């Protein structure tokens, strides 16, 4: 009675990563935020990694994204075993699309 | 090309909180997680507070929920600017719920 568990859809902003170096991502997110500063400043985002080939230093990637003001709520599209196992270690949840 | 930002829909676990004491909520959550551990461990959750009432210690509730391993990524169905205000302090986003 105290809780109920449900499954519901939420639209979230997704950052689809295509290059891997944190600094390049930081610069690119900066430019993107400037396209709608009032909405994208401090926006909660999900990091999608489906299109990544090179390995990603996650702690460093998490800091580079966070430094732009964006707030990382988790990671999606992670279709690797180890890699998945990695992300979940720093308290970051894995999210899946509907 | 290094980045894309677009909205996507995500099917999420929503814990609907009802009238109660952080210890009780922590109790109820552990019992749910135990029934489906393979799926529920470190799951991302949204906390729906629409059924809560005037007095509620948000810091105590968030700590209790997080203690179960669940990863609170946002709050939904909020009903006052007070509680709301207390939520964005810790940087938790507010979500709208399908």
Numbering used by the authors:
A (entry chain A), B (entry chain B): 4 to 101
Question: What did the article's authors report about this structure?
Answer:
We targeted E. coli MinC (EcoMinC) for a structural study and determined the crystal structure of the dimeric EcoMinCNTD at 2.3 Å resolution. We observed EcoMinCNTD as a dimer within the asymmetric unit. EcoMinCNTD forms a dimer via domain swapping between the first β strands in each subunit, as observed in the StyMinCNTD structure. Dimerization of TmaMinC is mediated solely by the MinCCTD domain; MinCNTD is not involved in dimerization in this species. By contrast, TmaMinC lacks the corresponding Gly and Ser residues and hydrophobic residues that stabilize the domain swapped β1–β1 interaction. To generate monomeric EcoMinCNTD, this antiparallel β1–β1 interaction should be broken and the hydrophobic residues will become exposed, because the long β1 strand cannot fold back to make the β-hairpin structure, as observed in the structure of TmaMinCNTD. Thus we see dimeric EcoMinCNTD in the result of size-exclusion chromatography, in a broad range of protein concentrations, as well as in the EcoMinCNTD crystal structure. By using unfused-EcoMinCNTD, we observed that EcoMinCNTD forms a stable dimer in solution and in the crystal, enabling us to conclude that EcoMinC dimerizes through both EcoMinCCTD and Eco­MinCNTD. Taken together, the results of our structural study of EcoMinCNTD reveal that domain swapped dimerization is a likely mode of interaction with polymeric FtsZ.
